[PDB]
Design a protein around this ligand. Structure first.
Ligand SMILES: O=S(=O)([C@H]1C[C@H]2O[C@@H]1C(c1ccc(O)cc1)=C2c1ccc(O)cc1)N1CCc2ccccc21
Ligand SMILES: O=S(=O)([C@H]1C[C@H]2O[C@@H]1C(c1ccc(O)cc1)=C2c1ccc(O)cc1)N1CCc2ccccc21
Lengths: 220, 237
């Protein structure tokens, strides 16, 4: 079914699954932990709505989510901050600037947002990229399951190209922009690693959702 | 300043010509290895490979148009990724094993000598199996290795700085064009071309992950990771 979707249907589905922008409830790290915790609940419901994801075993769904959760949070943050040069819009009521920064990661996030601004990243491209993160980040650490995932990934590639072609990009511009978008994903992975190790360095091991947590949330 | 003037065929030929040598490990290490002695062998191999990687980097079209400082920053961010993709390429035809050198072919169970390493060995072996599944070609590999050099550090760099970064993104576009040209000449449909381009670039996120995990281990242990000063000196020599 996922493999029968057109580009317009794929975009429509991902746009409908988009979580809302949440507000901070009001310690910088208290606030961010509580925000992420609330974001995670919406992320599970979002992931179930990504075409092809629920065709996977529950075990494989958890492994993909376990590997991608912080990259997904970060790319959302970068998207929200895109119109606020030099600032990070964690929430509409939590909009931070460097001197409030951790500052090495804070600067990497700002560089990503500047890059999205520079490329005029569009909302329909953003949701395709967040779905690529979900399906790609853990596929190389798991046979028919991994084949299905690559076929779904191929569909999201097709969707990205169709979006660009209808926006009037030439064939050359289409492939160049596809590569530019996917190459930023390597920087998002790097930032998630940096974030993970800093969650560790802070005495915050415990805040990372476990395999069993994600499994139970998926079951719920 | 004519790197952006190369055709696709001239880009591939430059990259193939730039390829570094295959090096050997120690001829007769005591085996079985200990944790300390295996790490010693791997570090010694990586230290010798680094010199040849700087020579290769200097021949990647566009790399020397950058300031020395920006050259080193790219090498600092990419060196382990570059060694790793070379390892995975070497190992493609050896399922279940990692061909560190012609005289150092390690299966999986040997990565267990080192705490934390079998995990990364399993990721490396998965990448080699993915390259095999995709029938990765040598012309594609050298394009990918060059993308890693230019892309991994670009997002962490005045008007000069924006022009350096713009230059990188233009060279990266040229290598994209080259990858597509290779695929179209091979006879792939346009749809297949875009799908394969994506598939190759998505593996680069996995290589970044593996390098991140390995760098963490490196920083945790001597000062094994090459310093800025060392990279600069190798570039100036
Ligand atoms: O540790 S950071 O990397 C933090 C940023 C980011 O990764 C971390 C984190 C997080 C995840 C789960 C938690 O339970 C708590 C925090 C991310 C996030 C991204 C998007 C969101 O929508 C929510 C969260 N870092 C870098 C800059 C910075 C400034 C202040 C404090 C920490 C910090
Ligand atoms: O990433 S590792 O798995 C290991 C394997 C492989 O990457 C590392 C290593 C290496 C590189 C430089 C060194 O100075 C020393 C070792 C490799 C290599 C790859 C390609 C080459 O052409 C040459 C070498 N790693 C890092 C340290 C560590 C501690 C505990 C667990 C795992 C781990």
């Amino acid at each position: 079914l996922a493999l029968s979707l057109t580009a317009d249907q794929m975009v429509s589905a991902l746009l409908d699954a988009e979580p809302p922008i949440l507000y901070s409830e009001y310690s910088m790290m208290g606030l961010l932990t509580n925000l992420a915790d609330r974001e995670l609940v919406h992320m599970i419901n979002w992931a179930k709505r990504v075409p092809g994801f629920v065709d996977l075993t529950s075990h494989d769904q958890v492994h993909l989510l376990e590997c991608a959760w912080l990259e997904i949070l970060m790319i959302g943050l970068v998207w929200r901050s895109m119109e606020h040069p030099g600032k990070l819009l964690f929430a509409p009521n939590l909009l931070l600037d460097r001197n409030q920064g951790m500052v090495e990661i804070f600067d990497m996030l700002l560089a990503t947002s500047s890059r999205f601004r520079m490329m005029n990243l569009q909302g329909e491209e953003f949701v395709c990229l967040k779905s690529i993160i979900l399906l790609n980040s853990g596929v190389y650490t798991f046979l028919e399951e991994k084949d299905h995932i690559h076929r779904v990934l191929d569909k999201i590639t097709d969707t990205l190209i169709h979006l660009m072609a209808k926006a009037g990009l030439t064939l050359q511009q289409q492939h160049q922009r596809l590569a530019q978008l996917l190459l930023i994903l390597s920087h998002i992975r790097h930032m998630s690693n940096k974030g993970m190790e800093h969650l560790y360095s802070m005495k915050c091991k415990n805040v990372v959702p476990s395999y069993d947590l994600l499994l139970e949330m998926l079951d719920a």
